[PDB]
């Protein structure tokens, strides 16, 4: 009898799933099909199944469906009562397809530890969508250290990726030395979010500030991890404060630090320390000292102490002098640099001692500049309107005094209304503001001095008592005043 074969579906992928079929038909010497005939069919090259035995159907056919994970030529042979027939079948290796493959990084964010690793996984598939193992694969990264590629013999390949440097890595693939276009993946190599007290630092621009609620000190926090990495995108960062109440501005992240400013309205100390949620870097704490604002507390004039908002002095004369007082004690004056805006007419020494030497003609200012905080200074302003001086030391008549004090159009015997008021005070009068002139120089003696009520009516004033008295016009000292 005869044994003829027909191959159906040849050239199947060598995926061990798709099958090639072979139909053997057994016929008699004449050409008719024989049924119920026993047929043994065998395959080679590792194909499955290897051997099958069966009977021919009514059309005298006995078939086999075979698969193979091994490409190349698979021979299938049938044997029946001596007769033997063979045919070659072909299994083709798959063709790797980038559009059917995948690449992933997990996790996608890693600490630039040099140890923590992202596992890069490639799912290598072919054109038919089948997995391809044993391929020569390599991963490439723009940054970091790619580990060793392990073929999981299932179609997937993996390798650990680490980095000691900060940055973003792009991983790509290469099969058989050539680039394989599966979409690249990224891996952000970041810093440990936990600051290392030792490498991190905390700085204040200035340790001492004025308690005016305006002068500020800048806080600069630089958090570095245990690897020496600067830590960015920090959440839960704050600046604690211990001491006098202070105002800390919101914090601003920079590319290399975290800053903020602080001002305060209460005198005292305060230690500011960085805290990153749960962690308080106490070894970084810094102190800021808020000082009292320099302030003019009074004017010391020949035994008195006048307030600063009275306009003193309205009158002046050669050698007149007073001591401005800073912060309730003149001992504090050496903490400032003293200067006058109109010299030498108005002089000031290092003790805040102001002494008049010549007349003024406009407003004048004596300024005290803080040595500690140079940007701060306080000034005492005044604008005298009377310049007093003598018209002789000898005792003269009122007519004499009158002429002697009229050396200028703006000269005349001092008006009594401006000479005194009885007591000492910043009332704009000569005696009221300065007291007895005898206390300033040797040009003024104790005694009666002529003062003026009207052009013809002269009065007299006691220099030591500041007392006015209208009546006995004998002789008296000429008291001149130049309006200025």
Short mmCIF file of C-alpha atoms in Angstrom, two decimals:
data_model
loop_
_atom_site.label_atom_id
_atom_site.label_comp_id
_atom_site.label_asym_id
_atom_site.label_seq_id
_atom_site.Cartn_x
_atom_site.Cartn_y
_atom_site.Cartn_z
CA UNK A 1 0.00 0.00 0.00
CA UNK A 2 0.87 3.72 -0.20
CA UNK A 3 1.64 6.50 2.28
CA UNK A 4 1.45 10.12 1.09
CA UNK A 5 1.99 13.26 3.17
CA UNK A 6 0.65 16.81 3.09
CA UNK A 7 2.15 19.63 5.20
CA UNK A 8 -0.21 22.36 6.42
CA UNK A 9 0.82 25.64 8.03
CA UNK A 10 4.61 25.28 7.59
CA UNK A 11 6.93 28.01 8.81
CA UNK A 12 5.29 28.48 12.21
CA UNK A 13 7.12 30.50 14.87
CA UNK A 14 9.41 28.44 17.10
CA UNK A 15 7.32 29.53 20.13
CA UNK A 16 6.22 26.07 21.24
CA UNK A 17 2.58 27.19 20.82
CA UNK A 18 1.76 27.59 17.14
CA UNK A 19 1.46 24.26 15.37
CA UNK A 20 2.32 22.92 11.97
CA UNK A 21 0.07 20.11 10.79
CA UNK A 22 0.90 17.00 8.78
CA UNK A 23 -1.67 14.76 7.20
CA UNK A 24 -0.69 11.28 6.12
CA UNK A 25 -3.10 9.44 3.91
CA UNK A 26 -2.88 5.66 3.58
CA UNK A 27 -4.22 4.13 0.37
CA UNK A 28 -4.27 0.74 -1.32
CA UNK A 29 -2.21 -0.33 -4.34
CA UNK A 30 -5.14 0.95 -6.44
CA UNK A 31 -5.49 4.42 -4.94
CA UNK A 32 -8.37 4.05 -2.49
CA UNK A 33 -8.13 5.29 1.13
CA UNK A 34 -7.83 2.69 3.90
CA UNK A 35 -9.47 3.39 7.24
CA UNK A 36 -8.76 1.95 10.65
CA UNK A 37 -5.09 1.64 9.77
CA UNK A 38 -2.53 1.94 12.56
CA UNK A 39 0.02 4.72 11.98
CA UNK A 40 3.04 5.64 14.10
CA UNK A 41 4.23 9.22 13.63
CA UNK A 42 7.47 10.62 15.05
CA UNK A 43 9.07 14.06 15.19
CA UNK A 44 12.62 15.22 15.93
CA UNK A 45 14.58 18.38 16.79
CA UNK A 46 12.85 18.54 20.16
CA UNK A 47 9.37 19.00 18.68
CA UNK A 48 6.30 18.11 20.78
CA UNK A 49 4.76 15.63 20.64
CA UNK A 50 7.62 13.23 19.85
CA UNK A 51 5.66 10.12 18.99
CA UNK A 52 1.97 9.45 18.43
CA UNK A 53 0.19 6.34 17.26
CA UNK A 54 -3.27 6.41 15.73
CA UNK A 55 -5.64 5.00 13.18
CA UNK A 56 -6.57 6.57 9.86
CA UNK A 57 -10.05 8.13 9.62
CA UNK A 58 -12.68 7.32 6.95
CA UNK A 59 -10.69 9.23 4.33
CA UNK A 60 -7.65 7.16 5.22
CA UNK A 61 -5.99 10.13 6.94
CA UNK A 62 -3.94 10.18 10.15
CA UNK A 63 -2.65 13.56 11.23
CA UNK A 64 -0.45 15.26 13.76
CA UNK A 65 -0.19 18.79 15.08
CA UNK A 66 3.28 19.66 16.30
CA UNK A 67 5.05 22.61 17.92
CA UNK A 68 8.64 23.46 18.68
CA UNK A 69 10.54 25.97 20.80
CA UNK A 70 13.57 25.19 18.64
CA UNK A 71 13.78 26.81 15.20
CA UNK A 72 15.06 25.06 12.12
CA UNK A 73 14.03 21.86 10.36
CA UNK A 74 11.73 19.37 12.11
CA UNK A 75 11.28 16.02 10.41
CA UNK A 76 8.01 14.21 10.79
CA UNK A 77 7.89 10.58 9.74
CA UNK A 78 5.02 8.12 9.50
CA UNK A 79 5.28 4.37 9.48
CA UNK A 80 2.62 1.86 8.46
CA UNK A 81 3.12 -1.85 7.78
CA UNK A 82 6.71 -1.47 6.65
CA UNK A 83 6.06 1.64 4.54
CA UNK A 84 7.70 4.83 5.78
CA UNK A 85 7.27 8.44 4.58
CA UNK A 86 9.01 11.64 5.79
CA UNK A 87 8.71 15.39 5.21
CA UNK A 88 10.60 18.37 6.54
CA UNK A 89 8.75 21.16 8.36
CA UNK A 90 10.23 24.51 9.30
CA UNK A 91 9.95 26.49 12.51
CA UNK A 92 11.09 30.11 12.28
CA UNK A 93 12.71 32.12 15.07
CA UNK A 94 10.76 35.21 16.06
CA UNK A 95 11.83 38.76 15.13
CA UNK A 96 12.21 41.12 18.10
CA UNK A 97 9.75 44.03 17.97
CA UNK A 98 10.38 47.25 19.90
CA UNK A 99 6.76 48.35 19.60
CA UNK A 100 5.56 45.14 21.27
CA UNK A 101 8.18 45.23 24.05
CA UNK A 102 8.26 47.17 27.35
CA UNK A 103 10.78 48.80 29.67
CA UNK A 104 10.21 49.99 33.22
CA UNK A 105 12.08 51.35 36.21
CA UNK A 106 10.96 50.54 39.74
CA UNK A 107 10.97 52.48 41.75
CA UNK A 108 11.30 55.64 39.63
CA UNK A 109 12.81 57.72 42.47
CA UNK A 110 15.94 56.65 44.33
CA UNK A 111 18.23 58.14 46.97
CA UNK A 112 21.66 58.87 45.42
CA UNK A 113 22.90 56.41 48.02
CA UNK A 114 25.28 54.51 45.77
CA UNK A 115 23.37 51.57 47.24
CA UNK A 116 19.59 52.07 46.87
CA UNK A 117 18.64 50.71 43.47
CA UNK A 118 15.95 50.96 40.84
CA UNK A 119 15.28 47.69 39.07
CA UNK A 120 15.12 48.17 35.32
CA UNK A 121 12.98 45.54 33.64
CA UNK A 122 12.65 44.90 29.92
CA UNK A 123 9.93 42.65 28.56
CA UNK A 124 11.42 41.40 25.29
CA UNK A 125 8.71 40.40 22.82
CA UNK A 126 8.80 39.59 19.10
CA UNK A 127 6.61 40.38 16.11
CA UNK A 128 4.05 37.70 16.99
CA UNK A 129 4.04 39.00 20.53
CA UNK A 130 5.94 36.05 21.98
CA UNK A 131 8.65 36.28 24.67
CA UNK A 132 12.27 35.93 23.57
CA UNK A 133 14.78 34.56 26.06
CA UNK A 134 18.52 34.06 25.79
CA UNK A 135 18.91 37.30 23.84
CA UNK A 136 22.05 39.38 24.23
CA UNK A 137 20.66 42.47 26.03
CA UNK A 138 22.35 45.53 27.53
CA UNK A 139 20.94 48.55 29.36
CA UNK A 140 22.37 52.04 29.02
CA UNK A 141 22.03 54.94 31.43
CA UNK A 142 22.92 58.60 31.01
CA UNK A 143 23.76 58.58 34.71
CA UNK A 144 24.73 56.11 37.43
CA UNK A 145 26.03 52.56 37.55
CA UNK A 146 24.09 49.89 35.67
CA UNK A 147 24.32 46.52 37.38
CA UNK A 148 24.51 43.11 35.70
CA UNK A 149 21.81 41.97 33.27
CA UNK A 150 20.03 38.82 34.39
CA UNK A 151 18.10 36.84 31.78
CA UNK A 152 15.09 35.35 33.56
CA UNK A 153 14.65 32.86 30.70
CA UNK A 154 10.99 33.86 30.46
CA UNK A 155 11.38 36.85 28.20
CA UNK A 156 12.22 39.44 30.82
CA UNK A 157 15.63 40.90 31.66
CA UNK A 158 16.66 42.89 34.72
CA UNK A 159 19.46 44.94 36.24
CA UNK A 160 19.81 47.14 39.36
CA UNK A 161 20.70 50.81 38.84
CA UNK A 162 22.25 52.99 41.55
CA UNK A 163 24.00 56.35 41.81
CA UNK A 164 26.11 58.41 44.22
CA UNK A 165 25.40 61.54 42.18
CA UNK A 166 22.20 63.60 42.03
CA UNK A 167 20.25 63.84 38.80
CA UNK A 168 17.93 62.18 36.33
CA UNK A 169 18.92 59.03 34.50
CA UNK A 170 17.58 57.86 31.15
CA UNK A 171 17.81 54.14 30.53
CA UNK A 172 17.73 52.71 27.02
CA UNK A 173 18.22 49.25 25.54
CA UNK A 174 20.59 47.52 23.15
CA UNK A 175 20.19 44.01 21.74
CA UNK A 176 23.13 42.35 20.01
CA UNK A 177 25.08 45.59 20.39
CA UNK A 178 22.42 47.55 18.48
CA UNK A 179 19.91 50.07 19.78
CA UNK A 180 16.45 48.62 20.49
CA UNK A 181 13.82 51.36 20.29
CA UNK A 182 11.61 50.45 23.24
CA UNK A 183 10.62 53.80 24.92
CA UNK A 184 13.28 54.95 27.42
CA UNK A 185 12.56 55.25 31.15
CA UNK A 186 13.77 57.72 33.76
CA UNK A 187 14.99 57.46 37.34
CA UNK A 188 15.38 60.48 39.61
CA UNK A 189 18.40 60.15 41.86
CA UNK A 190 17.67 62.33 44.88
CA UNK A 191 19.15 63.17 48.26
CA UNK A 192 18.14 61.45 51.47
CA UNK A 193 15.31 63.70 52.81
CA UNK A 194 16.80 63.42 56.29
CA UNK A 195 19.37 66.11 57.17
CA UNK A 196 22.67 65.19 58.79
CA UNK A 197 23.32 67.52 61.73
CA UNK A 198 27.03 67.33 60.94
CA UNK A 199 27.03 68.30 57.28
CA UNK A 200 24.08 70.68 57.42
CA UNK A 201 24.56 74.27 58.51
CA UNK A 202 22.47 77.18 59.82
CA UNK A 203 23.48 80.80 59.51
CA UNK A 204 22.27 84.25 60.55
CA UNK A 205 23.36 87.33 58.57
CA UNK A 206 23.68 89.40 61.76
CA UNK A 207 23.59 88.46 65.48
CA UNK A 208 22.46 91.83 66.89
CA UNK A 209 19.52 93.84 65.65
CA UNK A 210 17.45 96.76 66.87
CA UNK A 211 14.14 95.94 68.51
CA UNK A 212 12.29 98.30 66.15
CA UNK A 213 10.40 95.59 64.27
CA UNK A 214 12.20 96.69 61.12
CA UNK A 215 15.91 95.83 61.22
CA UNK A 216 16.12 92.16 60.32
CA UNK A 217 18.59 89.31 60.31
CA UNK A 218 18.50 86.79 57.50
CA UNK A 219 18.34 83.08 58.37
CA UNK A 220 20.05 80.71 55.97
CA UNK A 221 19.51 76.96 56.39
CA UNK A 222 21.58 74.55 54.28
CA UNK A 223 20.42 70.92 54.85
CA UNK A 224 22.88 68.28 53.63
CA UNK A 225 22.26 64.52 53.91
CA UNK A 226 24.66 61.85 55.18
CA UNK A 227 25.98 61.51 51.64
CA UNK A 228 26.92 65.17 51.31
CA UNK A 229 23.90 65.93 49.13
CA UNK A 230 22.05 69.21 49.46
CA UNK A 231 18.39 68.46 50.21
CA UNK A 232 15.83 70.07 47.93
CA UNK A 233 12.04 70.31 47.92
CA UNK A 234 11.99 70.09 51.70
CA UNK A 235 8.56 69.77 53.30
CA UNK A 236 7.84 70.25 56.99
CA UNK A 237 10.73 72.64 57.56
CA UNK A 238 10.42 75.31 60.25
CA UNK A 239 12.43 77.60 62.49
CA UNK A 240 11.69 77.24 66.18
CA UNK A 241 12.36 80.14 68.49
CA UNK A 242 13.24 80.13 72.14
CA UNK A 243 13.41 83.41 74.01
CA UNK A 244 11.84 86.80 73.54
CA UNK A 245 8.94 86.74 71.04
CA UNK A 246 10.10 87.34 67.48
CA UNK A 247 8.64 87.47 63.96
CA UNK A 248 9.93 84.97 61.42
CA UNK A 249 8.94 85.51 57.80
CA UNK A 250 7.74 82.57 55.75
CA UNK A 251 10.64 80.43 54.58
CA UNK A 252 11.82 80.44 50.96
CA UNK A 253 13.54 77.49 49.27
CA UNK A 254 16.59 78.40 47.20
CA UNK A 255 18.66 76.22 44.91
CA UNK A 256 21.32 75.84 47.62
CA UNK A 257 19.68 76.96 50.87
CA UNK A 258 16.45 77.85 52.63
CA UNK A 259 16.12 81.43 53.82
CA UNK A 260 13.88 83.64 55.98
CA UNK A 261 14.09 86.93 57.88
CA UNK A 262 13.43 87.89 61.47
CA UNK A 263 12.52 91.15 63.20
CA UNK A 264 11.22 91.80 66.71
CA UNK A 265 9.69 94.44 68.96
CA UNK A 266 10.94 93.18 72.32
CA UNK A 267 14.41 93.56 73.78
CA UNK A 268 16.20 90.32 74.62
CA UNK A 269 17.69 87.10 73.29
CA UNK A 270 16.31 84.36 71.09
CA UNK A 271 17.76 81.15 69.78
CA UNK A 272 16.46 80.00 66.42
CA UNK A 273 16.92 76.39 65.43
CA UNK A 274 15.99 74.52 62.23
CA UNK A 275 13.46 71.74 62.49
CA UNK A 276 12.62 69.29 59.71
CA UNK A 277 9.46 67.59 60.94
CA UNK A 278 10.34 65.33 63.91
CA UNK A 279 13.96 66.38 63.76
CA UNK A 280 15.21 69.44 65.60
CA UNK A 281 18.83 70.21 64.73
CA UNK A 282 19.64 71.80 68.11
CA UNK A 283 23.37 71.68 67.47
CA UNK A 284 22.71 74.27 64.75
CA UNK A 285 20.77 76.73 66.90
CA UNK A 286 21.86 80.34 66.51
CA UNK A 287 21.27 83.32 68.76
CA UNK A 288 19.95 86.76 67.81
CA UNK A 289 20.00 89.66 70.27
CA UNK A 290 17.48 92.48 70.01
CA UNK A 291 18.70 95.73 71.48
CA UNK A 292 16.83 98.79 72.74
CA UNK A 293 16.32 101.58 70.19
CA UNK A 294 18.61 104.58 70.86
CA UNK A 295 16.57 107.40 72.32
CA UNK A 296 17.00 111.03 73.38
CA UNK A 297 15.72 111.08 76.97
CA UNK A 298 16.41 114.66 78.00
CA UNK A 299 18.35 117.91 78.04
CA UNK A 300 20.61 118.78 80.96
CA UNK A 301 21.01 122.55 81.32
CA UNK A 302 22.73 124.16 84.30
CA UNK A 303 21.13 121.86 86.84
CA UNK A 304 17.86 121.32 85.04
CA UNK A 305 16.59 118.53 82.80
CA UNK A 306 14.13 119.69 80.18
CA UNK A 307 11.94 117.60 77.91
CA UNK A 308 12.95 117.35 74.24
CA UNK A 309 9.65 118.47 72.68
CA UNK A 310 9.65 122.05 73.97
CA UNK A 311 11.73 123.88 71.38
CA UNK A 312 14.65 124.61 73.66
CA UNK A 313 16.60 126.80 73.32
CA UNK A 314 14.99 129.96 71.92
CA UNK A 315 17.87 132.06 73.19
CA UNK A 316 21.62 131.49 72.92
CA UNK A 317 24.81 133.39 73.73
CA UNK A 318 28.56 132.78 73.57
CA UNK A 319 29.57 129.80 75.78
CA UNK A 320 26.05 128.65 76.44
CA UNK A 321 26.06 124.88 76.86
CA UNK A 322 23.86 121.86 77.51
CA UNK A 323 24.21 118.07 77.51
CA UNK A 324 21.82 115.98 75.43
CA UNK A 325 21.08 112.71 77.23
CA UNK A 326 20.82 109.36 75.48
CA UNK A 327 18.85 106.50 76.99
CA UNK A 328 18.32 107.94 80.49
CA UNK A 329 22.04 108.27 81.34
CA UNK A 330 24.77 110.48 79.85
CA UNK A 331 27.20 107.64 80.56
CA UNK A 332 25.61 106.10 77.45
CA UNK A 333 26.66 108.98 75.16
CA UNK A 334 30.06 107.41 74.48
CA UNK A 335 28.15 104.77 72.50
CA UNK A 336 27.38 107.31 69.78
CA UNK A 337 29.28 109.45 67.34
CA UNK A 338 28.26 113.07 67.90
CA UNK A 339 28.11 115.76 65.22
CA UNK A 340 26.63 119.23 64.64
CA UNK A 341 25.25 120.47 61.29
CA UNK A 342 26.42 124.06 61.83
CA UNK A 343 30.00 124.38 63.13
CA UNK A 344 31.79 125.94 64.94
CA UNK A 345 28.83 128.14 65.92
CA UNK A 346 27.28 125.03 67.45
CA UNK A 347 29.79 122.48 68.73
CA UNK A 348 29.31 119.03 70.23
CA UNK A 349 31.97 116.81 71.81
CA UNK A 350 32.07 113.06 72.45
CA UNK A 351 29.94 113.48 75.56
CA UNK A 352 26.97 115.04 73.81
CA UNK A 353 27.99 118.35 75.33
CA UNK A 354 26.65 121.08 73.01
CA UNK A 355 28.21 124.50 73.31
CA UNK A 356 27.30 127.67 71.43
CA UNK A 357 30.13 129.83 70.21
CA UNK A 358 28.51 132.11 67.61
CA UNK A 359 24.98 132.97 66.48
CA UNK A 360 22.86 130.80 64.16
CA UNK A 361 20.60 131.88 61.28
CA UNK A 362 18.44 128.83 60.66
CA UNK A 363 17.48 125.51 62.21
CA UNK A 364 20.45 123.53 63.49
CA UNK A 365 20.83 119.82 64.26
CA UNK A 366 23.06 117.95 66.70
CA UNK A 367 23.10 114.24 65.81
CA UNK A 368 23.90 111.10 67.77
CA UNK A 369 24.78 108.14 65.54
CA UNK A 370 24.78 104.65 67.07
CA UNK A 371 28.25 103.07 66.97
CA UNK A 372 26.67 99.62 67.26
CA UNK A 373 24.04 100.13 64.56
CA UNK A 374 25.50 102.84 62.27
CA UNK A 375 22.35 102.85 60.15
CA UNK A 376 20.60 104.35 63.20
CA UNK A 377 20.92 107.87 64.51
CA UNK A 378 18.85 110.40 66.46
CA UNK A 379 18.96 114.17 66.05
CA UNK A 380 18.04 117.12 68.25
CA UNK A 381 16.78 120.05 66.22
CA UNK A 382 16.49 123.66 67.34
CA UNK A 383 16.20 127.11 65.83
CA UNK A 384 17.25 129.98 68.13
CA UNK A 385 15.66 133.40 67.57
CA UNK A 386 17.66 135.49 70.04
CA UNK A 387 21.41 135.97 70.40
CA UNK A 388 22.29 137.50 73.77
CA UNK A 389 25.52 139.40 74.51
CA UNK A 390 26.84 142.23 76.70
CA UNK A 391 27.22 145.89 75.87
CA UNK A 392 29.89 146.62 78.45
CA UNK A 393 30.81 145.31 81.88
CA UNK A 394 30.49 148.69 83.63
CA UNK A 395 27.27 149.75 85.35
CA UNK A 396 25.42 152.28 83.16
CA UNK A 397 22.23 154.28 82.83
CA UNK A 398 19.22 152.89 80.99
CA UNK A 399 19.72 155.43 78.16
CA UNK A 400 23.31 154.24 77.90
CA UNK A 401 22.25 150.59 77.81
CA UNK A 402 19.67 151.46 75.16
CA UNK A 403 22.21 152.95 72.80
CA UNK A 404 24.86 150.30 73.51
CA UNK A 405 22.55 147.43 72.58
CA UNK A 406 21.43 149.04 69.34
CA UNK A 407 24.46 148.24 67.21
CA UNK A 408 22.35 146.51 64.54
CA UNK A 409 18.87 147.08 63.12
CA UNK A 410 17.93 143.83 64.86
CA UNK A 411 19.65 144.77 68.09
CA UNK A 412 18.02 146.17 71.23
CA UNK A 413 17.96 145.67 75.00
CA UNK A 414 16.44 142.22 75.59
CA UNK A 415 12.64 142.40 75.90
CA UNK A 416 11.59 141.55 79.44
CA UNK A 417 8.96 139.15 78.07
CA UNK A 418 11.92 137.11 76.78
CA UNK A 419 14.30 137.69 79.69
CA UNK A 420 12.56 135.59 82.32
CA UNK A 421 9.23 134.44 83.74
CA UNK A 422 10.37 133.85 87.29
CA UNK A 423 11.30 130.17 87.30
CA UNK A 424 13.48 127.80 85.33
CA UNK A 425 11.85 126.15 82.31
CA UNK A 426 11.92 125.64 78.52
CA UNK A 427 9.63 128.66 78.12
CA UNK A 428 11.81 130.30 75.48
CA UNK A 429 13.22 132.95 77.84
CA UNK A 430 16.86 133.65 78.62
CA UNK A 431 16.85 133.01 82.37
CA UNK A 432 14.12 130.39 82.08
CA UNK A 433 16.21 128.28 79.71
CA UNK A 434 19.74 128.90 81.00
CA UNK A 435 19.44 130.28 84.51
CA UNK A 436 22.12 132.73 85.65
CA UNK A 437 24.56 133.53 82.83
CA UNK A 438 27.28 133.76 85.48
CA UNK A 439 27.39 129.97 85.34
CA UNK A 440 28.72 129.91 81.76
CA UNK A 441 31.52 132.46 81.55
CA UNK A 442 33.36 135.34 83.21
CA UNK A 443 31.63 137.99 81.06
CA UNK A 444 28.52 138.06 83.22
CA UNK A 445 28.45 139.15 86.86
CA UNK A 446 25.78 138.87 89.53
CA UNK A 447 23.62 141.96 89.70
CA UNK A 448 20.91 143.97 88.01
CA UNK A 449 20.67 143.89 84.24
CA UNK A 450 18.55 146.23 82.14
CA UNK A 451 15.64 144.59 80.30
CA UNK A 452 13.01 146.22 78.09
CA UNK A 453 9.25 146.66 78.53
CA UNK A 454 8.70 149.31 75.83
CA UNK A 455 10.97 151.71 73.92
CA UNK A 456 10.95 154.19 76.82
CA UNK A 457 10.07 151.91 79.73
CA UNK A 458 13.00 149.88 80.99
CA UNK A 459 12.83 147.36 83.80
CA UNK A 460 15.63 145.45 85.46
CA UNK A 461 16.38 141.74 86.09
CA UNK A 462 18.38 140.04 88.83
CA UNK A 463 20.81 137.65 87.11
CA UNK A 464 20.96 135.14 89.96
CA UNK A 465 17.28 135.10 90.95
CA UNK A 466 15.84 135.45 87.48
CA UNK A 467 13.49 137.90 89.18
CA UNK A 468 12.02 140.89 87.33
CA UNK A 469 11.44 144.19 89.14
CA UNK A 470 9.98 147.49 87.83
CA UNK A 471 10.83 150.61 89.83
CA UNK A 472 14.28 151.98 90.82
CA UNK A 473 16.15 152.85 87.63
CA UNK A 474 19.62 153.56 88.99
CA UNK A 475 22.49 151.94 87.17
CA UNK A 476 22.60 148.45 85.70
CA UNK A 477 24.42 146.13 83.34
CA UNK A 478 23.54 146.37 79.64
CA UNK A 479 21.82 143.18 78.46
CA UNK A 480 21.79 143.06 74.66
CA UNK A 481 19.91 140.73 72.39
CA UNK A 482 20.11 140.34 68.62
CA UNK A 483 17.05 138.80 67.00
CA UNK A 484 18.13 136.06 64.59
#
